[PDB]
Amino acid sequence: MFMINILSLIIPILLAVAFLTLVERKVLGYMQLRKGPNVVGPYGLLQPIADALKLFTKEPLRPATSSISMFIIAPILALSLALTMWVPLPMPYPLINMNLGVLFMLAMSSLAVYSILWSGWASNSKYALIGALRAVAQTISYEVTLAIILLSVLLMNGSYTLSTLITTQEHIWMIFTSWPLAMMWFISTLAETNRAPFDLTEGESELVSGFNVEYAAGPFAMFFMAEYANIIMMNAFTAILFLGASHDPHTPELYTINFVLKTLALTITFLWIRASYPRFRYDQLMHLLWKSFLPLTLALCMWHISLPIMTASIPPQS
Amino acid sequence: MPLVYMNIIMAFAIALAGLLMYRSHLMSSLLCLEGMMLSLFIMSTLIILNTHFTLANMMPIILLVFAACEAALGLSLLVMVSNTYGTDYVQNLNLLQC
Amino acid sequence: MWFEILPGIAVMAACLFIPGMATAHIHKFTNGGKEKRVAHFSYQWNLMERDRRISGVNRYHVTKGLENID
Amino acid sequence: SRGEYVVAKLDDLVNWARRSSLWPMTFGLACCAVEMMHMAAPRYDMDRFGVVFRASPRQSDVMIVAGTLTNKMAPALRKVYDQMPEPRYVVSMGSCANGGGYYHYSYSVVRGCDRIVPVDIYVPGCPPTAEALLYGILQLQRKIKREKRLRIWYRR
Amino acid sequence: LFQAEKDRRVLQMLRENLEEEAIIMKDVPDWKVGESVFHTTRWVTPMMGELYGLRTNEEILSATYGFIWYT
Amino acid sequence: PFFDVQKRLGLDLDRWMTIQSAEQPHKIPGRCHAFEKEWIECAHGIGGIRAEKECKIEFDDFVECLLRQKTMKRLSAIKRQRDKLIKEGKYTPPPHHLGKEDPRP
Amino acid sequence: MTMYIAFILSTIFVIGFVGFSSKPSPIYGGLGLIVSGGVGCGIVLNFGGSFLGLMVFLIYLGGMLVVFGYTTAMATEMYPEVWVSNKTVFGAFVSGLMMEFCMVYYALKEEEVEIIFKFNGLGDWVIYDTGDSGFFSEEAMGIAALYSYGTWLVIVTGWSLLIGVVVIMEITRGN
Amino acid sequence: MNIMLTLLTNVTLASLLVLIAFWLPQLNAYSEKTSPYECGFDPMGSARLPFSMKFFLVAITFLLFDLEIALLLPLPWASQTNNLKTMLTMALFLLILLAASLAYEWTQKGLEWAE
Amino acid sequence: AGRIASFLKNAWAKEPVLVASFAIGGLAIILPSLSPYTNYAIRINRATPYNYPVPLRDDGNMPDVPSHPQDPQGPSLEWLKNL
Ligand SMILES: CCCCCCCCCCCCCCCCC[C@@H](O)O[C@H](CO[C@H](O)CCCCCCCCCCCCCCC)COP(=O)(O)OCC[N+](C)(C)C
Ligand SMILES: CCCCCCCCCCCCCCCCC[C@@H](O)O[C@H](CO[C@H](O)CCCCCCCCCCCCCCC)COP(=O)(O)OCC[N+](C)(C)C
Ligand SMILES: CCCCCCCC/C=C\CCCCCCCC(=O)O[C@H](COC(=O)CCCCCCC/C=C/CCCCCCCC)COP(=O)(O)OCCN
Ligand SMILES: CCCCCCCC/C=C\CCCCCCCC(=O)O[C@H](COC(=O)CCCCCCC/C=C/CCCCCCCC)COP(=O)(O)OCCN
Ligand code: SF4
């Protein structure tokens, strides 16, 4: 019966990714004084279906100068990790209940970078190499600040379990307690998902197509799905972490609906941000994270260590 | 001793033998050193968990810390070597004899 | 329209509803309709094992009340 | 036969997917590219037809030759054409790409892009209006709707 | 209550293990039934290899990996 | 060499972690707490040379608690004799070792 | 030996070690070390050390990424070596695999001592403790206890880390 | 067991997707189609040449700082202890040393990239 | 008063992030020692019953030890119920 649950977690996420491509296109169109896809199907509903069919019936290309084994492995790893992201998330009941869910998600997110790294290296192309090195720089920029941000925000929770976050925010949202962190966390997610203004590993204005310039058809499609699935998963994680919905043990549908609405709002927020700002330089992102976010993150970590002790409000779980 | 203990010990032995043999690259030997730290971490963690030594649960963490500095140290040396020769080949480290 | 983006967002919401709702329904169905037990620590797992042993059918969710005291 | 019906339906489905989503490589040479920029502008909004510019040739379906092809540029055009995964289509935009145009009798001009690559649609004009290029794009879509690959494979 | 039940369950399983160990060990020349491995005569907590050793594999998994694998 | 500043100053910099019988958090005991306690109390002040010989019984018990080699050998003997009796068909293991035991709380 | 899970993971660990032990290239050495780190995380998790396994995986994942960055810049070679592109790399890889296989076969079919002592087998489930108590994790409290108990360890570790930063700055100065 | 099944299913789905991608469409690969792409012209060197990295010092600093986060990870459990003053003092001391390391490298121009 | 004020004003003009970080860090260092609720936090941590309270064997002269959990003797958590 667990296989049915795995499939029910996998297939709807892929469909939601396919249709997020559509929403992303239509939102950008209407924010740029145009319409967007509205011809293929009613209101463009069949465009995602059309895009998938064309991509998987087109010939995949294997570069003459590229390592083939790692070239094939990289998109598989990216997509598999993107799908594996979702199993510990409580909606309100996680598929896998872990005592350490935040750590698991953090470690797997760290592992996800090697797909981009090995795609850039295995393609044996100069632009792919530049994109891979930009990915290295981005990860070095963001992981430390993101980790201390998680630690500081979870001090209030008292445990790394994702499920306990619903109990922590039963009366108020976490964003009313740690809004200065949430902002930074938000920006960190934009860097972790390689999204504007931090779309540097796949920068089309400089690197033609970045790390996946040599990829085509199915492997490119899998990379694209991994990107959008990671976007949705990170927005869901932000919603659970900072916007705690109420849960009825006899009626979890209300929690599911509210959580989905918040996740959609955050995803639309990313789509809105992409159409509003220019792109950074990959050294400017590192300087922003190290010279601005790191000192504030350390100070707020000290503050959130001290505050429960000062106010006698330490969370329960040992 | 279970088979797991012998597997971890022989992994450490393999990493040590890999370090003690140099092909051309210093980076490969640094990787072998880091592998030795990983094997030691796994072995000590298994020993501590098996015997329920509670207060020793913190020593693997400390171990990892003193891996990183060491690893960091090695990386620093490597770049200097590169800056002198343009390659990380151990052949170029031959100005000093016995 | 600007409200023509709504069908795609609605399809997204319909797709994202399925994971959590199906997980909750499967948890109720497999564990007798009462919110599958969470065992974060060994004490809770021991409680589950005791329930499974005393259930007489090898299912932990089958609960025995006061009707087992004679 | 039922096999004939099945291959007809599959070909229709395959043809529809390709025509619905057409990605033209971000590639312009001269005057005509500006008009191409106006086809992506809010007034015409080629994106609403499923048409999206993509910088990488490996992720491109159409190559729109928008401008004068010179003798110095022809190898690069041929190279970027050869790196498009099949099926790929070429649309010749404007007089310069069609037949040399206003520089036909020049030492440094290729007299039509069709000496270098095979062309599907010839859009006339100097430059063709954004409506003219859009009409050519829809004509290419109709041509793709008309092709039959599974039927030929079944009969052969 | 749980402590009392645990004591009785462990003692019962040890007793069954001893009775079978007597059953298997009919004619081994110098084998003592129920011999300890410790010089000390105090109670030593069972190894859990001493308990489910002569039992089926499914409950061996349940006893060893049951808690770790349950999510 | 060994400059015992901890004993001189009464500081306890690192003596809290040397043994598993020394004040674990939440009073969690070691798996061989009793054996190490007995071995340490046997050899407290007699010295290393005398300890290695006179407190060998407690040390042997402690080590076999740590590694369980003798228990493994005994269980392996039991298992192999049971297997050879089963292969020729003279044992017929009881139902409660086959998963049919009437469970108890 | 039930489900052979710990033994299989340990075999993959040693196999993973062999791949980067061979020094075919920094890119594939890092890949092998990532594989061995992941399977070691699995091995530690199977024994109840969830936090320690996840921590070592994260640290290695972060560390390996830096190594990849360094490799492109300084350890790069025009024709990078894989385990079958060179005679000596393949020889070392095959030698490691065969030593793994022979030691496993001798220790499983027979009971032979390699260096320290011998083994019997029967799986790693025998050595367990059947401990039944607690609303907490023993590993979490042990790791958790460092702040309260290891005051000296925290001091020496923090001093070592700050000194290490200073050391890196001073070494990479050049001039 | 459930997590291993989940990972196996995810990897199997990705592998089936790549197999479908590589075995469904018609393939016509020749020499020039599979050549490296560098804007239309032939590349001069190879992508496997050394690639100078201007943030190596920041990379080593990230290696050292990554370890520090591991130390701070167990803080939530640490908060409970009965010796709250000692735990707070040590946590603040560790964070202060991390901040001092960052400040020292900042003031010594270690955060600026090579030219 | 006149020099540090100008320096702080210039730092706030140029580096507001650093000023905020140092202010928050200094507050987090100083205030815990000047708080009356830290002792309450330590008491709450001590009051959590993680493990079984093993009863003591009666010798006959332990007036401060209760014979029943509901006896008036022993520690009281009424300070916690109103906190
Ligand atoms: C989305 C996740 C779930 C998917 C679930 C399904 C899994 C899909 C598996 C992925 C592959 C499907 C792709 C669809 C077409 C299959 C391609 C291949 O298998 O067919 C040919 C396989 O034929 C080979 O020539 C092998 C023939 C004989 C050699 C060994 C086969 C021995 C089997 C015995 C057969 C006897 C009768 C069997 C029935 C009783 C290879 O042709 P080839 O030209 O290379 O490649 C181009 C294919 N084109 C033409 C369609 C473009
Ligand atoms: C002789 C000259 C001395 C000064 C020279 C300094 C150089 C040596 C480095 C520091 C030496 C000081 C020794 C401190 C060791 C810590 C242990 C002792 O102090 O007691 C602890 C008290 O720790 C307190 O937190 C105070 C010590 C913390 C010191 C703060 C920072 C000191 C660092 C200064 C030097 C380090 C290098 C330079 C840094 C810039 C434990 O208290 P408690 O919790 O009851 O007991 C726990 C055990 N239980 C659970 C069984 C009950
Ligand atoms: C009473 C006790 C209280 C304890 C202390 C608490 C008070 C703290 C008061 C200050 C908190 C402010 C911190 C907020 C985050 C820091 C922001 C910051 O300082 O960084 C900016 C930089 O910020 C950015 O540039 C962001 C760029 C990316 C923009 C992306 C989109 C914009 C945001 C969209 C909405 C975000 C929504 C956030 C919440 C989402 C829900 C979780 C400064 O950078 P520079 O000006 O370049 O200075 C360096 C040169 N000297
Ligand atoms: C021991 C206390 C610990 C607690 C607080 C610490 C928490 C974390 C904060 C520290 C993180 C690291 C800080 C690193 C500082 C380095 C500063 C530096 O060198 O940068 C200078 C610039 O920085 C300065 O301007 C000097 C310091 C500025 C003020 C710093 C704080 C001073 C005191 C403020 C707080 C006072 C107390 C709080 C009162 C607040 C009012 C209520 C150079 O700028 P560049 O980026 O290199 O290039 C610019 C030209 N292109
Ligand atoms: S056809 Fe006319 S408008 Fe177009 S590129 Fe040539 S000269 Fe310019």
Side-chain angles (χ1 to χ4, degrees), chain A residues 1-159 161-318, chain B, chain C residues 2-70, chain D, chain E, chain F, chain G residues 1-20 22-110 121 123 125-146 148-175, chain H, chain I residues 1-8 10-83:
Chain A
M1 194 72 171
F2 195 74
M3 281 291 335
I4 296 91
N5 222 342
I6 299 179
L7 294 174
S8 162
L9 189 87
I10 284 181
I11 298 181
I13 297 299
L14 298 189
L15 296 171
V17 161
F19 279 91
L20 171 60
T21 65
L22 165 63
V23 176
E24 217 272 11
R25 279 167 88 170
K26 288 206 70 85
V27 167
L28 268 70
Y30 277 107
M31 265 179 183
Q32 297 160 344
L33 214 63
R34 43 188 185 86
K35 287 186 180 293
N38 67 350
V39 167
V40 177
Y43 313 111
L45 279 187
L46 287 169
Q47 186 77 76
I49 298 61
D51 282 344
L53 297 183
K54 183 264 291 179
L55 271 183
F56 269 89
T57 54
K58 185 176 180 180
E59 66 182 1
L61 280 178
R62 155 190 178 173
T65 43
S66 80
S67 312
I68 187 73
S69 294
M70 185 179 288
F71 192 85
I72 304 302
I73 293 169
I76 289 166
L77 170 80
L79 188 58
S80 65
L81 294 174
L83 296 179
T84 311
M85 295 298 102
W86 287 85
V87 293
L89 288 166
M91 294 182 286
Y93 305 127
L95 184 55
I96 301 296
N97 211 340
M98 303 163 180
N99 269 309
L100 297 172
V102 191
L103 299 201
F104 169 82
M105 296 222 294
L106 183 62
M108 298 290 130
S109 296
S110 302
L111 174 61
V113 191
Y114 290 93
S115 45
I116 293 179
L117 293 196
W118 292 335
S119 296
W121 187 84
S123 294
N124 209 339
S125 180
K126 292 206 186 51
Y127 284 107
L129 189 73
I130 304 170
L133 268 299
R134 292 199 173 177
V136 162
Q138 192 143 346
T139 313
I140 282 179
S141 308
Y142 73 70
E143 292 180 353
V144 159
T145 71
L146 188 153
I148 296 89
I149 281 158
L150 293 174
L151 158 75
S152 306
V153 71
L154 287 162
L155 266 163
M156 271 291 180
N157 188 22
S159 85
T161 317
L162 291 172
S163 318
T164 306
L165 276 166
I166 314 183
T167 310
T168 303
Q169 320 186 55
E170 184 161 315
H171 305 289
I172 205 177
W173 286 346
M174 194 72 75
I175 207 179
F176 295 120
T177 312
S178 66
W179 71 261
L181 291 161
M183 279 158 86
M184 292 193 286
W185 166 261
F186 201 70
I187 300 315
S188 296
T189 58
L190 274 165
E192 190 276 331
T193 52
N194 317 135
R195 285 291 291 196
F198 316 107
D199 62 84
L200 298 162
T201 75
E202 190 276 331
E204 168 264 328
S205 314
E206 293 83 3
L207 306 181
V208 180
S209 187
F211 69 99
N212 59 344
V213 57
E214 300 281 275
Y215 276 91
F220 167 68
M222 293 183 286
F223 275 120
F224 183 77
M225 317 159 86
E227 173 60 6
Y228 277 72
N230 285 322
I231 287 185
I232 303 179
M233 176 291 288
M234 281 301 255
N235 286 311
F237 192 23
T238 304
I240 297 167
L241 201 70
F242 287 110
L243 305 170
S246 288
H247 178 28
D248 202 322
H250 291 279
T251 315
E253 293 83 3
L254 262 62
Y255 181 91
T256 306
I257 289 174
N258 189 359
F259 151 81
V260 161
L261 286 190
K262 283 157 170 139
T263 298
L264 283 198
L266 292 173
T267 311
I268 302 308
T269 303
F270 285 172
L271 309 182
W272 181 11
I273 283 175
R274 150 154 180 165
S276 299
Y277 303 118
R279 187 184 302 113
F280 275 72
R281 273 202 277 118
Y282 64 95
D283 73 324
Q284 292 179 346
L285 163 72
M286 188 179 287
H287 281 128
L288 163 76
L289 266 292
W290 280 73
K291 298 192 170 180
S292 295
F293 277 25
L294 201 44
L296 275 173
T297 313
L298 296 181
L300 288 171
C301 197
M302 284 199 263
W303 176 250
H304 279 96
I305 293 165
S306 297
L307 175 78
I309 311 181
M310 294 183 286
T311 58
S313 64
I314 299 189
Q317 277 324 117
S318 185
Chain B
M1 293 177 70
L3 284 184
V4 188
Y5 283 0
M6 293 180 183
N7 263 321
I8 306 307
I9 289 182
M10 182 179 72
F12 176 92
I14 288 163
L16 169 70
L19 170 65
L20 287 170
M21 293 180 183
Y22 293 87
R23 282 203 56 235
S24 295
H25 279 315
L26 197 69
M27 185 64 73
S28 293
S29 54
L30 297 191
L31 285 186
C32 296
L33 187 63
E34 293 179 353
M36 269 193 279
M37 293 299 291
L38 172 62
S39 69
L40 288 178
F41 179 98
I42 300 305
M43 189 76 209
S44 66
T45 299
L46 291 188
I47 297 181
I48 289 156
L49 290 171
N50 186 60
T51 52
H52 295 263
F53 203 114
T54 306
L55 277 177
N57 285 125
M58 63 182 91
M59 62 79 70
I61 302 297
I62 311 289
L63 195 62
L64 280 185
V65 170
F66 285 90
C69 297
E70 174 187 287
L73 198 63
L75 281 190
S76 294
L77 293 169
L78 191 150
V79 62
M80 295 298 102
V81 164
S82 188
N83 279 347
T84 318
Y85 298 103
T87 46
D88 73 4
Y89 288 177
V90 293
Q91 287 69 241
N92 301 323
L93 303 175
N94 63 337
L95 297 181
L96 314 165
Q97 293 82 17
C98 289
Chain C
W2 63 268
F3 37 77
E4 310 179 353
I5 319 176
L6 294 176
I9 296 176
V11 170
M12 274 188 92
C15 292
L16 280 174
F17 282 167
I18 301 304
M21 293 180 183
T23 311
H25 279 334
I26 291 178
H27 284 308
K28 292 181 181 179
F29 175 71
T30 313
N31 314 251
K34 43 172 172 288
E35 195 166 356
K36 146 178 180 174
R37 181 95 44 79
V38 175
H40 281 319
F41 310 111
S42 60
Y43 169 74
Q44 310 165 324
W45 172 253
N46 293 337
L47 285 175
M48 290 179 63
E49 286 314 279
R50 192 185 172 275
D51 302 342
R52 187 181 53 79
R53 275 186 255 111
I54 62 170
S55 72
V57 65
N58 210 29
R59 281 75 178 272
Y60 90 100
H61 45 276
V62 191
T63 177
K64 303 306 191 174
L66 277 183
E67 61 275 356
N68 281 66
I69 321 296
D70 297 337
Chain D
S1 159
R2 297 296 296 173
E4 210 80 30
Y5 182 90
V6 166
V7 297
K9 247 52 190 183
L10 276 160
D11 199 79
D12 276 353
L13 175 72
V14 173
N15 289 350
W16 170 85
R18 302 202 168 114
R19 94 177 96 99
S20 303
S21 175
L22 278 174
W23 299 343
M25 176 177 33
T26 303
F27 187 40
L29 312 163
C31 298
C32 284
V34 185
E35 283 292 19
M36 172 154 93
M37 274 164 153
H38 275 250
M39 182 179 72
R43 171 161 304 188
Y44 293 106
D45 192 19
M46 77 188 200
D47 184 64
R48 83 184 189 84
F49 297 92
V51 172
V52 177
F53 274 127
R54 179 66 65 192
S56 175
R58 326 281 203 176
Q59 308 147 11
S60 294
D61 292 331
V62 192
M63 182 179 72
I64 305 178
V65 187
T68 313
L69 188 70
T70 54
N71 283 336
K72 204 165 181 191
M73 181 75 206
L77 178 82
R78 186 62 211 207
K79 174 66 77 177
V80 296
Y81 167 77
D82 270 317
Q83 299 176 326
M84 304 177 62
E86 293 179 354
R88 67 210 169 187
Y89 309 96
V90 177
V91 179
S92 181
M93 183 177 177
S95 295
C96 286
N98 286 349
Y102 194 40
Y103 315 93
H104 179 98
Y105 297 103
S106 186
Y107 56 91
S108 65
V109 166
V110 176
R111 297 169 190 87
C113 66
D114 52 336
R115 322 192 163 224
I116 315 297
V117 297
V119 182
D120 276 297
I121 306 285
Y122 292 81
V123 186
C126 183
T129 78
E131 293 179 353
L133 178 60
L134 191 46
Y135 179 87
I137 292 316
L138 297 197
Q139 208 191 336
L140 167 70
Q141 286 189 349
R142 262 173 271 129
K143 175 175 187 173
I144 294 173
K145 173 175 191 168
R146 196 172 67 238
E147 57 183 63
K148 46 181 73 68
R149 315 207 191 213
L150 303 203
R151 291 161 172 300
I152 295 300
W153 161 82
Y154 191 79
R155 292 180 179 91
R156 80 159 65 212
Chain E
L1 182 77
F2 299 149
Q3 177 74 54
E5 314 170 1
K6 182 175 174 66
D7 283 18
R8 289 196 220 83
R9 183 172 63 251
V10 161
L11 280 190
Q12 174 147 309
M13 185 179 288
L14 276 181
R15 168 56 89 175
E16 318 191 295
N17 281 189
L18 172 66
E19 287 186 351
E20 322 313 322
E21 190 276 331
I23 294 284
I24 295 92
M25 295 296 172
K26 299 289 94 175
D27 313 307
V28 176
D30 51 348
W31 187 275
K32 324 172 84 70
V33 165
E35 183 178 1
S36 182
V37 298
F38 298 93
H39 293 121
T40 183
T41 45
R42 82 167 159 266
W43 171 261
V44 176
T45 305
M47 172 186 180
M48 155 164 274
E50 293 179 353
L51 288 169
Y52 301 96
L54 315 175
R55 283 168 166 253
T56 187
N57 286 11
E58 293 83 3
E59 65 183 1
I60 287 172
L61 272 78
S62 165
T64 304
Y65 296 111
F67 176 54
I68 318 291
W69 288 3
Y70 177 76
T71 56
Chain F
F2 182 76
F3 287 115
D4 214 335
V5 300
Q6 295 179 45
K7 179 179 184 183
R8 180 46 172 283
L9 298 176
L11 206 52
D12 187 15
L13 287 175
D14 72 2
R15 270 209 299 162
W16 49 274
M17 184 177 176
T18 54
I19 58 183
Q20 74 187 359
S21 299
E23 182 65 26
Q24 308 295 305
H26 290 306
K27 301 302 188 196
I28 309 161
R31 183 179 63 83
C32 301
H33 174 277
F35 290 103
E36 184 163 357
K37 179 256 193 186
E38 294 293 328
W39 172 64
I40 292 173
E41 293 179 353
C42 184
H44 157 66
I46 60 181
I49 310 188
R50 270 187 65 194
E52 190 276 331
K53 285 171 290 185
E54 293 179 353
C55 295
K56 197 197 172 188
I57 291 181
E58 294 82 3
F59 189 75
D60 282 0
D61 272 339
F62 183 29
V63 180
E64 191 276 331
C65 181
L66 276 174
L67 297 177
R68 296 288 184 156
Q69 279 171 258
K70 292 177 178 176
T71 302
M72 293 180 183
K73 290 187 286 184
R74 184 170 180 89
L75 292 169
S76 288
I78 301 297
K79 288 230 181 153
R80 67 184 68 188
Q81 177 81 357
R82 182 205 60 168
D83 291 331
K84 67 184 289 184
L85 261 69
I86 278 181
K87 188 261 289 180
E88 57 92 18
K90 285 185 182 293
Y91 174 42
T92 313
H96 57 71
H97 286 298
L98 294 174
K100 292 177 70 68
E101 162 65 18
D102 191 298
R104 63 182 300 167
Chain G
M1 185 180 288
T2 49
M3 295 296 172
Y4 311 86
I5 293 285
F7 176 73
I8 283 160
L9 288 174
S10 305
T11 304
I12 301 173
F13 192 76
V14 187
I15 296 180
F17 264 64
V18 181
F20 80 70
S22 317
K23 276 94 77 284
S25 189
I27 303 298
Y28 297 101
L31 186 140
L33 190 43
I34 288 163
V35 167
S36 49
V39 297
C41 173
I43 297 164
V44 174
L45 261 55
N46 285 13
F47 275 63
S50 62
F51 183 89
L52 278 162
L54 285 171
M55 206 72 251
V56 75
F57 196 35
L58 194 48
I59 298 300
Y60 270 72
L61 282 174
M64 275 306 81
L65 161 145
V66 164
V67 165
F68 175 93
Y70 267 81
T71 294
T72 303
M74 305 141 188
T76 187
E77 180 193 7
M78 167 152 192
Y79 288 125
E81 293 179 353
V82 302
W83 292 280
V84 301
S85 70
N86 199 245
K87 187 269 183 182
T88 186
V89 184
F90 187 67
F93 187 76
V94 164
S95 300
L97 285 195
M98 295 298 102
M99 293 180 183
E100 160 74 26
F101 272 11
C102 69
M103 185 207 78
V104 161
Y105 194 79
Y106 289 164
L108 183 63
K109 305 297 288 292
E110 322 191 330
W125 60 277
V126 298
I127 54 174
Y128 275 56
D129 185 41
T130 178
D132 283 17
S133 64
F135 268 112
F136 49 79
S137 183
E138 283 83 320
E139 183 205 16
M141 305 330 270
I143 311 181
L146 153 79
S148 60
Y149 276 89
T151 301
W152 187 237
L153 279 186
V154 170
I155 287 175
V156 301
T157 305
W159 180 253
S160 295
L161 288 161
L162 169 56
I163 281 300
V165 174
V166 175
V167 171
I168 302 314
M169 294 299 291
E170 202 64 67
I171 289 181
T172 45
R173 186 179 295 276
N175 293 126
Chain H
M1 179 39 102
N2 281 350
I3 184 70
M4 293 182 286
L5 205 71
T6 284
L7 293 155
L8 171 69
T9 293
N10 292 331
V11 176
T12 302
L13 195 145
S15 299
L16 291 203
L17 265 192
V18 67
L19 282 173
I20 284 183
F22 267 97
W23 280 91
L24 186 69
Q26 174 75 39
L27 308 194
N28 177 18
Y30 40 91
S31 295
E32 298 287 352
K33 173 181 286 189
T34 54
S35 296
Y37 162 93
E38 198 173 81
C39 293
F41 288 111
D42 274 327
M44 176 171 201
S46 48
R48 301 282 186 253
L49 293 174
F51 198 69
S52 185
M53 182 179 72
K54 307 304 170 165
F55 50 92
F56 59 93
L57 183 62
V58 190
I60 309 159
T61 300
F62 165 79
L63 272 191
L64 291 165
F65 278 23
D66 198 17
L67 279 308
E68 309 222 42
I69 88 172
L71 292 175
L72 299 173
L73 281 192
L75 274 178
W77 299 302
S79 306
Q80 325 279 339
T81 187
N82 294 348
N83 317 120
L84 275 192
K85 292 180 182 177
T86 291
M87 173 282 312
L88 182 61
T89 306
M90 299 324 294
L92 288 184
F93 160 88
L94 211 70
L95 277 169
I96 283 178
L97 294 175
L98 180 48
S101 296
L102 174 63
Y104 168 75
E105 183 178 1
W106 190 340
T107 61
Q108 296 310 123
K109 300 295 187 291
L111 292 196
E112 327 290 334
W113 290 21
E115 293 83 3
Chain I
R3 183 201 297 163
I4 65 154
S6 279
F7 153 78
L8 283 172
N10 175 78
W12 185 247
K14 285 187 184 293
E15 294 293 328
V17 180
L18 288 181
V19 188
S21 296
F22 273 93
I24 300 159
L27 294 178
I29 297 169
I30 297 169
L31 282 71
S33 56
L34 294 174
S35 186
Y37 283 130
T38 304
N39 316 325
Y40 286 111
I42 304 174
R43 287 217 277 153
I44 294 180
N45 270 332
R46 263 197 272 289
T48 312
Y50 282 103
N51 47 42
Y52 190 74
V54 189
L56 292 170
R57 175 183 268 265
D58 212 334
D59 43 25
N61 48 8
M62 284 138 78
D64 290 331
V65 176
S67 287
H68 195 271
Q70 278 165 309
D71 283 8
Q73 297 92 23
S76 172
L77 264 51
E78 280 202 354
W79 63 268
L80 187 41
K81 182 174 72 68
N82 317 108
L83 193 79

